[PDB]
Symmetry: C3
Subunit: 105 residues, 3 copies
């Protein structure tokens, strides 16, 4: 399984550097406590988006995993690297197939 | 900090240059009114210029998701938005309404 | 309902041919055993992506259906690798079955 961080933004894609991509990969790997070899990052820039009624710069993101500290770091990463006001960075953390944990004595 | 935002995503093979500022404004308003929510809580994402096949054809189409955390008139209002503003035939528009984490409603007799 | 195969890739969309799209449509229709008229293919190319720490060509995909996958998975991987020229070790596919947790039967 590969945790995946998807960023949808109306920032022009030319403002998304490879340096930012690697920094995001490392941040996500450290946040989830998983090896970077299993992490996928997907930045979809230059999108036509409305966020709260405004088309001003924004980011709508999902961190998807199967089954805290670095999460606020993900917010700062978006705001500082993409130059998006923090109140227009939105992230949904999605844990798929993670409803049940079972223990035997 | 914490808080959910309903989001309408449109995936389409029409060029993104055909996605106007007016259309975005209208889509935000239409979704907000369909959901009965203020526009400040709604997110719109039009992902155009995609390479798509819809029922075996590459003709203009739209595959969409209205996602909420925690719908018939709404569906026709959205289909009208797509067909009238983006000029995608309704028969090549597909919309899924996804309600996340909404399986269980709890009541106490006190309530 | 319409099953949907979504491919997110950093290869440019100019390398995503109509032949590839039609072949992917057919492959999905046969794998899921559903008519091609209900199948959707969506390739989101030219994306800025990192896969396992590298920005080399890669593909992250989801085959979503509402309401077996080992044999068809290899067909989809071969399709990605041969047609889009993405190394198989940098193709990742999630098969997602929505609203399919429970099947109920009466003995009749
Ligand atoms: Na926070």
């Amino acid at each position: 399984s590969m945790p995946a961080f998807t960023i949808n933004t109306n920032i022009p894609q030319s403002n998304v550097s490879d340096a930012f991509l690697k920094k995001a990969s490392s941040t996500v790997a450290k946040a989830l406590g998983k090896p970077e070899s299993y992490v996928a990052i997907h930045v979809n820039g230059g999108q036509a988006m409305v966020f709260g009624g405004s088309t001003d710069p924004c980011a709508v993101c999902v961190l998807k995993s199967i089954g805290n500290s670095h999460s606020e770091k993900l917010f700062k990463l978006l705001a500082d690297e993409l130059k998006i006001p923090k109140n227009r960075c939105y992230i949904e953390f999605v844990n798929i197939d993670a409803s049940t944990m079972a223990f035997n004595g």
